[PDB]
Design a protein around this ligand. Structure first.
Ligand SMILES: [K+]
Ligand SMILES: [K+]
Ligand SMILES: [K+]
Ligand SMILES: [K+]
Ligand SMILES: [K+]
Ligand SMILES: [K+]
Ligand SMILES: [K+]
Ligand SMILES: [Mg+2]
Ligand SMILES: [Mg+2]
Ligand SMILES: [Mg+2]
Ligand SMILES: [Mg+2]
Ligand SMILES: [Mg+2]
Ligand SMILES: [Mg+2]
Ligand SMILES: [Mg+2]
Ligand SMILES: [Mg+2]
Ligand SMILES: [Mg+2]
Ligand SMILES: [Mg+2]
Ligand SMILES: [Mg+2]
Ligand SMILES: [Mg+2]
Ligand SMILES: [Mg+2]
Ligand SMILES: [Mg+2]
Ligand SMILES: [Mg+2]
Ligand SMILES: [Mg+2]
Ligand SMILES: [Mg+2]
Ligand SMILES: [Mg+2]
Ligand SMILES: [Zn+2]
Lengths: 190, 52, 196, 139, 175
RNA sequence: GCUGGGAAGGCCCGGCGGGGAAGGUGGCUCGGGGG
RNA sequence: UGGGCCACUUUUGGUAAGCAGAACUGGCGCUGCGGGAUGAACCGAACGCCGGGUUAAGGCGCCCGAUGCCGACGCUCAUCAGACCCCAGAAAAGGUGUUGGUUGAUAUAGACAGCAGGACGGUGGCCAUGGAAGUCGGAAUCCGCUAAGGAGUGUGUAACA
RNA sequence: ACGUCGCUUUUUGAUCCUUCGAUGUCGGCUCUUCCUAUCAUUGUGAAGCAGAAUUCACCAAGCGUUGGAUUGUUCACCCA
RNA sequence: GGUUGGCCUCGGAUAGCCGGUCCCCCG
């Protein structure tokens, strides 16, 4: 069955404006600019209000598979609004049983040094994605704070760190050591 | 000597998971069907066995 | 059975609200089953309390109300986990005893703490085999007279924070009063009147 | 993005089929592929018609769906589509394309003569404008 | 049975009069067939299943096409049918929108072939009925019950791909 | 030529009407906009 | 001439066989031609030497004659897709991929899914016992508060919790 | 387990279609290539995976898979 | 032995394109 119209609207806040160039959404909030294209999805994007700034996504004559993309675009756009207004902050805890994992943050938070993961002498060098800054928190002893505007980039940077500290040739249920994403949140808390 | 709350966090990514009985795929705890073609997306799943 | 159970409930509420012209609406916090029996015993000698699905309450007092007026004021007021208590006594004698018969419920895991409780420095008195819980939470203790003794006060918990799974068990073994809270009244209804 | 929509009262131009070159009004829609179609002032009686042969215009009539032909004709005649259609660039390109096809051998000769003179006068003036604009002496 | 654009036929038959019952009862059926020859053949197929009749023991007294009584009106058709799958026989209820009853039945024969690989000889139409818009059960049919229905034609594919076969301009799809 | 002596359909605002409704017009109510 | 063989269907032995043995009709042998790429037996059709017209079976992206139809309606994405009698490869069993259908059920007296509270007393119910308290087992399956609690669905504990 | 569905042609049968105016008939030696139903090695998932060791499974045939005693042996068995 | 006028050029999108013009920024 092909459904005539599947549509869904996201509400743009006042401090952020959205500009459309075809299926290319440019989000210009107070924390920067986020730009991402959706030319791989055949949808219609429209800015509705001059007062409340509504963005509506429409799919005409869609099958089940391509109705699933309507809310995917809306969720991606809402993350752009969230990123440019509040930012994205991922907190990572470095858990270990015996050898403490020493983390050194190199230039501008773009390189992460893992020294003593499970006591081995190999040095792990993980590069942050562009626009993502890593830092060592001052609140808890073993935290890493990943801050950025794009949830795609911040979360993938966090996954790079987590997958770098992977135990091999041992029982992962017993050797739980590593750096894991503790919570996912924002900056500015609003 | 891992303090318990961080022990739970590590177990979230290492232990609290489902295993496909046909292709041993490591799945999220709420999985009902395996995500992999090579077993045919079977619903023959079992919990990952604990060290307890 | 659901139709009969719902119909039985409608007959019960409508006959009870016609019988009792004075009632309080009361909110239900995290009140355990042992407490509802406690209040139900302490109340049934002279009054009755009714609790259940809020929609059953709105529907009963919307279709079978037309016999009497002044009852529609409850319709915009029965919201959330709230119910009625029906009484024939005065307001003061029922409110004060309702507030008096509080039950000191223990702190469950994953429950918020609106109150702040701090353990003092005193001889706990339990056996010298429970130091693991004190060591896990970070309380330094030494054995005195074959018992565990707290050398200084430590700030166990704050207002409005999460109770740890291994933190609530130290409350239970120490037998102190945690944050506790009962069947608190929302507002009253006296023959078509709203007060505090 | 979309500006022209299939809807009740939407006037469509028939591109091919037995009714090619006609204007019709969409009265009702069926099964996504076809529509109830009626052109009372363009000699197309009510009938089903695939959406593939339609090309939507910018004219929308106001009548309820599945209304009788009389009401469609009244809506078509009031604010008449026939004169409005003939005034559009779309229609006069259709008409121009038609008269060029029916042009005879004598007309082809006279067009060849007129085009020859017109192009020489225009292309003269282009050279003059080029030569004039070539006088740019400034820092 | 093959197909094409099916037509509705009103076929009336009866047994031959025998010196047991002088006036045997008359029976009527609605047959959707490409032509009256097939319609008469399918009539004997059905009355033989229901009653104890044969073409040789009976006769057909009438076989005329049933013209659609409102071919200018859009209506929803509910069709009850039984078909034999590769592994059994199933009863189906299906809905279609069309201007004619025979057009709706023709849609059903194509749809059963497309979705269930059912050939016409396996399909057995047992009830065709014009249903009200509020009695429809299929969402594909129901979504067209909108007095303000409005939809664009999104990605118009060029169909004259060989006239011209070679060109300078790439085709437009937004119209 | 035949057919349901075709079925529909067009015009006569079809006229005296009756009934039914809904893919519900106007109006009214509620919720969002342009001076 | 008295070696036959093949195909539809019927049919005996055999696990089966491009095996062995019968019945019936047709065929190959003795037969070319169109189609099945190719092929004794399949499908069409049987043949003097030619011109024109039309077909059969089979086809009409290109090889390669013919769709270079503004063909109709759907279904399907395959990191071994599929693609035409004989025929030249596949089963049981699975899929929360998608499509259609059957039956049943819940729901404004508010379903479903999520987030958040309650989830009790007799009773740590009886007989098993070393502890089996709801959860190692054999039987029973009740009462009250009830909105609701099973004298218990699973985790867990030696038993508890 | 009781049952039941397959695959393979490295076993052995079954058949007798090709070869009886002849296709040199076992084993070993030598040498190349191919298959994967993977013994090892690379990368992984699972465990009754603490480590060590081992077992099951996936992508996977790139690379390697040996020296000897007895036997014509193929096989077999033992030594290292 | 063929042949029987030429086309001298945006990039491309397709749920979109093409053309023109005033301010801003690039010498
Ligand atoms: K003879
Ligand atoms: K003889
Ligand atoms: K063999
Ligand atoms: K042989
Ligand atoms: K020989
Ligand atoms: K040898
Ligand atoms: K040897
Ligand atoms: Mg979400
Ligand atoms: Mg190991
Ligand atoms: Mg002989
Ligand atoms: Mg013989
Ligand atoms: Mg034989
Ligand atoms: Mg033989
Ligand atoms: Mg011979
Ligand atoms: Mg012969
Ligand atoms: Mg022949
Ligand atoms: Mg041939
Ligand atoms: Mg072939
Ligand atoms: Mg000829
Ligand atoms: Mg061919
Ligand atoms: Mg050709
Ligand atoms: Mg020879
Ligand atoms: Mg020789
Ligand atoms: Mg030789
Ligand atoms: Mg393999
Ligand atoms: Zn699997």
């Amino acid at each position: 069955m092909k459904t005539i119209l599947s549509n869904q609207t996201v509400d743009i806040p006042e401090n952020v404006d959205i500009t459309l160039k075809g299926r290319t959404v440019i989000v210009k909030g107070p924390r920067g600019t986020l730009r991402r294209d959706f030319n791989h999805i055949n949808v219609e994007l429209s800015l509705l209000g001059k007062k409340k700034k509504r963005l509506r996504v429409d799919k005409w004559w869609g099958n089940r598979k391509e109705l699933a993309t309507v809310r995917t675009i809306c969720s991606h756009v809402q993350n752009m609004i969230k990123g440019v207004t509040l930012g994205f902050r991922y907190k990572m805890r470095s858990v270990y049983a015996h050898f403490p994992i020493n983390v050194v943050i190199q230039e501008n938070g773009s390189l992460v040094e893992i020294r003593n993961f499970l006591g081995e002498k190999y040095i792990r060098r993980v590069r942050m994605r562009p626009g993502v800054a890593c830092s060592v928190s001052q609140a808890q002893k073993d935290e890493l704070i990943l801050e950025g505007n794009d949830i795609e980039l911040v979360s993938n940077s966090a996954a790079l760190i987590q997958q770098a500290t992977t135990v091999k040739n041992k029982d992962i249920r017993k050797f739980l050591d590593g750096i894991y994403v503790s919570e996912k949140g924002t900056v500015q808390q609003a | 000597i891992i303090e318990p709350s961080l022990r739970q966090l590590a177990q979230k990514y290492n232990c609290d998971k489902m295993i496909c009985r046909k292709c041993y795929a490591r799945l999220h705890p709420r999985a009902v069907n395996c995500r992999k073609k090579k077993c045919g997306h079977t619903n023959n799943l079992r919990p990952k066995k604990k060290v307890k | 059975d659901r139709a009969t159970w719902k119909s039985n409930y409608f007959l019960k509420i409508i006959q009870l609200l016609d019988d009792y012209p004075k009632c309080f609406i009361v909110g239900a916090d995290n009140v355990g089953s042992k407490q509802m029996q406690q209040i139900r015993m302490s109340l049934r000698g002279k009054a009755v309390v009714l609790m259940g699905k809020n929609t059953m309450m709105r529907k009963a007092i919307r279709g079978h109300l037309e016999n009497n007026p002044a009852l529609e004021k409850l319709l915009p007021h029965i919201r959330g986990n709230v119910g009625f208590v029906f009484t024939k006594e005065d307001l003061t004698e029922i409110r004060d005893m309702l507030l008096a018969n509080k039950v000191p419920a223990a702190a469950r895991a994953g429950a918020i703490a609106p109150c702040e409780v701090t353990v003092p420095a005193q001889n706990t008195g339990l056996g010298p085999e429970k130091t693991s819980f004190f060591q896990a939470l970070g309380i330094t203790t030494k054995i005195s007279r074959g018992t565990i003794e707290i050398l200084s006060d430590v700030q166990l918990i704050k207002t409005g924070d999460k109770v740890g799974a291994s933190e609530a068990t130290l409350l239970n073994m120490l037998n102190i009063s945690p944050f506790s809270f009962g069947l608190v009244i929302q507002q009253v209804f006296d023959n078509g009147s709203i007060y505090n | 993005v979309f500006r022209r929509f299939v809807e009740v009262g939407r006037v469509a131009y028939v591109s091919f089929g037995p009714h090619a070159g006609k204007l019709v009004a969409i009265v009702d829609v069926i099964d996504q592929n076809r529509a109830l179609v009626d052109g009372p002032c363009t000699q197309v009686r009510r009938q089903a018609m695939p959406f593939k042969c339609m090309q939507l215009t910018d004219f929308i009539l106001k009548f309820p769906h599945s209304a009788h032909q009389k009401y469609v004709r009244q809506a078509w005649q009031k604010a008449d589509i026939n004169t409005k259609w003939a005034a559009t660039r779309w229609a006069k390109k259709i008409e121009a394309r038609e008269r060029k096809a029916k042009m005879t051998d004598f007309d082809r000769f006279k067009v060849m003569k007129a085009k020859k003179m017109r192009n020489r006068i225009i292309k003269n003036e282009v050279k003059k404008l080029q030569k004039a604009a070539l006088l740019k002496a400034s820092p | 049975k093959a197909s094409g654009t099916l037509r509705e036929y009103k076929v009336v038959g009866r047994c031959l009069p025998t010196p047991k019952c002088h006036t045997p009862p008359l029976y009527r059926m609605r047959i959707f067939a490409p032509n009256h020859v097939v319609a008469k053949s399918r009539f004997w197929y059905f009355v033989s299943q229901l009653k104890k009749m044969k073409k040789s023991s009976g006769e057909i007294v009438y076989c005329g096409q049933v013209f659609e009584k409102s071919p200018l009106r859009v209506k929803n058709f509910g069709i009850w049918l039984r078909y034999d799958s590769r592994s059994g026989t199933h009863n189906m209820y299906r809905e279609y929108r069309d201007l004619t009853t025979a057009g709706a039945v023709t849609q059903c024969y194509r749809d059963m072939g497309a979705r269930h690989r059912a050939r016409a000889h396996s399909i057995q139409i047992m009830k065709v009925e014009e249903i009200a818009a509020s009695k429809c059960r299929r969402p594909a049919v129901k979504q067209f019950h909108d007095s303000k229905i409005k939809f664009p034609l999104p990605h118009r594919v060029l169909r004259r791909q060989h006239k011209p076969r070679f060109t300078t301009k790439r085709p437009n799809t937004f119209f």
